[PDB]
Design a protein around this ligand. Structure first.
Ligand SMILES: Nc1ncnc2c1ncn2[C@@H]1O[C@H](COP(=O)(O)OP(=O)(O)OP(=O)(O)O)[C@@H](O)[C@H]1O
Ligand SMILES: [Cl-]
Ligand SMILES: [Mg+2]
Length: 487
């Protein structure tokens, strides 16, 4: 036994490469992803991010300058935890839960691990309650239900963050705790977003997790897992949470950079790319739980950035496949002034449709049909030698409906208002106005409804359907408004 191996290879390891806040270890054969380890000599801790045999990747938490090749590493057998709960509402934190807003310590009473295994179907029940974004295009055509996974995808500067942040702003009074995860964005941009969340009153029920462009890849990589945990605190305690991952494209880039920081062991240059599994694990944690587990939910809104609208690229293909629905944004729409720049024909939300309230179902069906007919006709309309009156009417209706789907940033709309405005459209009441005046008509109409017909809005709101009685009154209110509207 003069030269026998001294260490336990399952729970103990040896640093074989260290630098730029990362280490690679021999041993630690039984370590799991996101498990804490300790560098014995220095007392510093780390978190496992890669389980390659005898080449385990470790994110060093804190001072890495003192860690040397040959140092012993020991499993702590604990998944790294973050503070979660009410104490984080109103706060801006990094992925480890440290405050970044100057408001003092968090003093959290609860903690959760950044990784858990997503519960199986036995623990879930069907999505049955809406998550109102307050954005007409989505709430009508791409309804989201609480517990689902909805992708927001499109090129840079198409309005992706805007949808997400407006959705958050709209959760005031909706009973939804919100977690906004900024991954890889510039500090300056993130600051602006936090300011808007503050200004529009969202921070009361919102936690912002930041790992900026200037933060290490390691923090960017941990960010969404920490954010999910923070949301799970509510989901698993009979409450509803929404977590925004902005964005998973930058997250994939950070995970890739982490892997590239250490060199490959000689004679093995290709370990598999499991970014698909990383995002799959993250998103499966969106859940609609059963009654025995409290009935709460966690809705996920991952964001993916495309290049040249290439939704066939790798990350896009991955996340499209592991989400229940997709909202597609496009630069052509954006540039034409169709904002939000959502392609409502291509976008889809399977699981949300049944959860959508009845009042909205009552107007979304016709909307969808009218837009379908419009887009068919637009195939050839501009090259038609002539179009009959009926066809012209269908085009006009369609142009009016598209105009109604335009909406300014930071202005999410109550569902009952969406309903009466979309009713006016689908029923033809904007057909005789110039298209350029639809926005104003909408603005003036809704003032008019509060001023003279609040009881209609109240009824739709309370009943969540448009009854025949209220429908008739609505028809008359619209006609009444038109009476005085100045074209
Ligand atoms: N509904 C809207 N109406 C008018 N302008 C909007 C709307 N939504 C977003 N914008 C504006 O369009 C621009 C792009 O928005 P945003 O940054 O949310 O898009 P993005 O896809 O997240 O871009 P990035 O690639 O920078 O993350 C911003 O200047 C934003 O203020
Ligand atoms: Cl911990
Ligand atoms: Mg963005």
């Amino acid at each position: 036994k003069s030269f026998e191996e001294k260490i336990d290879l399952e729970d103990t390891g040896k640093v074989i490469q260290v630098g730029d806040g990362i280490a690679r270890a021999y041993g630690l054969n039984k370590v799991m992803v996101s498990e804490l380890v300790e560098f014995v000599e220095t007392g510093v801790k780390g978190v496992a991010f890669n389980l390659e045999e005898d080449n385990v990747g470790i994110i060093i938490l804190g001072e890495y300058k003192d860690i040397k090749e040959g140092h012993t590493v020991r499993r702590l057998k604990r998944i790294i935890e973050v503070p979660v709960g009410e104490e984080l509402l109103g706060r801006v934190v990094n992925p480890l839960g440290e405050p970044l807003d100057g408001k003092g310590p968090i003093n959290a009473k609860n903690f959760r691990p950044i990784e858990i295994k997503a519960p199986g179907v036995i623990y879930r029940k069907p999505v049955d309650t809406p998550l109102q974004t307050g954005i007409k295009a989505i709430d009508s055509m791409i309804p989201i239900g609480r517990g689902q996974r909805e992708l927001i995808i499109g090129d840079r500067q198409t309005g992706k963050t805007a949808i997400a942040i407006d959705t958050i702003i709209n959760q005031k009074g909706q009973g939804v705790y919100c977690i906004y995860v900024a991954i890889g964005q510039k500090k300056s941009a993130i600051a602006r977003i936090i300011d808007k969340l503050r200004q529009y009153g969202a921070m009361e029920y919102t936690t912002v997790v930041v790992a900026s462009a200037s933060d290490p890849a390691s923090l960017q990589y941990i960010a969404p897992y920490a954010g999910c945990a923070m949301g799970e605190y509510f989901a698993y305690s009979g409450r509803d949470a929404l977590v925004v991952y902005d964005d998973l494209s930058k997250h994939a880039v950070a995970y890739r950079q982490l892997s590239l920081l250490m060199r490959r062991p000689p004679g093995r240059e290709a370990y598999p790319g499991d970014i698909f599994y990383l995002h799959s694990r993250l998103l499966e944690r969106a859940v609609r739980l059963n009654d025995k587990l409290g009935g709460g939910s966690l809705t996920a809104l991952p964001i993916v950035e495309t290049q040249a609208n290439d939704i066939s690229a790798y990350i896009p293909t991955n996340v499209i496949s592991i989400t229940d629905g997709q909202i597609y944004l496009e630069p052509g729409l954006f540039y034409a002034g169709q904002r939000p720049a959502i392609n409502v024909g291509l976008s889809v939300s399977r699981v949300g449709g049944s959860a959508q309230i009845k009042a909205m179902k009552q107007v979304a069906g016709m909307l969808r049909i009218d837009l379908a007919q419009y887009r068919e006709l637009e195939t050839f309309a501009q090259f038609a030698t002539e179009l009959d009156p009926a066809t012209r009417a269908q085009i006009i209706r369609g142009q009016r409906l598209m105009e109604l789907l335009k909406q300014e940033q930071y202005s999410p709309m109550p569902v009952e208002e969406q309903v009466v405005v979309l009713f006016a459209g689908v029923r033809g009441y904007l057909d005789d106005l110039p298209v350029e005046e639809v926005r104003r008509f909408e603005k003036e109409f809704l003032r008019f409804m509060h001023e003279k017909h609040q009881d209609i809005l109240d009824d739709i709101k309370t009943k969540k359907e448009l009854t025949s009685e209220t429908e008739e009154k609505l028809k008359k209110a619209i006609e009444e408004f038109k009476t005085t509207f100045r074209v």
